[PDB]
Ligand binder design. Structure first.
Ligand code: HEC
Length: 85
């Protein structure tokens, strides 16, 4: 399952800084619905690019994660965001 796979990817790669949809480094850049909309990060392309390319203290995962995992993770974040985390 892509959403099921996205969760596995999230756990092994994203929870270190975003467990529960938060942001352990920059408290304002969370994965919550309203913040994601405010930052224009609520679409699949925008999130997959940020994951692939990284940004500031967030690492780039293009090298390490295969394209499918980056997508499934993006979708996982979006669904969780809409369910409230
Ligand atoms: C800590 C070492 C991080 C890891 C591992 C991941 N992310 Fe991250 N993310 C982190 C920071 C410090 C920031 C803010 C970057 C900046 O300078 O603005 C982010 C941001 C995001 C966002 C955008 C959130 C928003 O705009 O409110 C997303 C969608 C995001 N991060 C996703 C994400 C995913 C899915 C990860 C696993 C592949 C991931 N991040 C890991 C820090 C860290």
């Amino acid at each position: 399952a892509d959403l099921d796979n996205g969760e596995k990817v999230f756990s092994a790669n994203c929870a270190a800084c975003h467990a529960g949809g938060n942001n352990a480094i920059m408290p304002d850049k969370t994965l919550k619905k309203d913040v994601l909309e405010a930052n224009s990060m609520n679409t699949i392309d925008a999130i997959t690019y940020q994951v692939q390319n990284g940004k500031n203290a967030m690492p780039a995962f293009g090298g390490r994660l295969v394209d499918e995992d980056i997508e499934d993770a993006a979708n996982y974040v979006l669904s969780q965001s809409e369910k409230g985390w």
